[PDB]
């Protein structure tokens, strides 16, 4: 089990140092930022707070925002 302080789905080392969300076949996948792969595909590099369930204190987690599991 990787550590997770804020229980927001994504691990602590990914929030501090960068991450992104990619799809491979038709399956979402939350992966750390690799500039060799993810930059050509036009993705974004997210950073958040490893101790806040929602970094901007709204009622939507950092997992729900970047993935799409949100009110549309």
């Amino acid at each position: 089990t990787v550590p997770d302080r804020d229980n927001d789905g994504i691990p602590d080392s990914l929030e501090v140092e960068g991450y992104t969300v990619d799809v491979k076949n038709k399956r979402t996948f939350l992966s750390p930022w690799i500039s060799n792969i993810h930059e050509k595909k036009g993705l974004t590099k997210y950073k958040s707070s490893p101790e806040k369930w929602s970094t901007a204190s709204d009622p939507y987690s950092d997992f729900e925002k970047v993935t799409g599991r949100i009110d549309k």
């Binding site: 990787v2 691990p11 080392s13 990914l14 491979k24 996948f29 992966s31 750390p32 690799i34 792969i37």
Partner: protein
């Protein structure tokens, strides 16, 4: 060919030692599985007994 291999095994060495770091930095091993699912299994074959036969086959030459 044994010449291109002999002249470019440095990049054949960086290609392995990079994937060794992905398999054991525990936050991102799954970035190896969904971007290279055969290199992941090859390192899984190493970790599940493959490292034993490369460890036991050196002390037998330690005589």
């Amino acid at each position: 060919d044994i010449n291109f291999i002999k002249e470019n095994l440095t990049e054949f060495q960086h290609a392995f030692s990079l994937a060794f770091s992905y398999y054991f930095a525990p936050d991102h091993r799954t970035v190896l599985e969904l971007y290279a699912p055969d290199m992941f299994e090859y390192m899984n074959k190493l970790e599940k007994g493959g490292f034993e036969k490369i460890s036991e086959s050196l002390k037998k030459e330690g005589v």
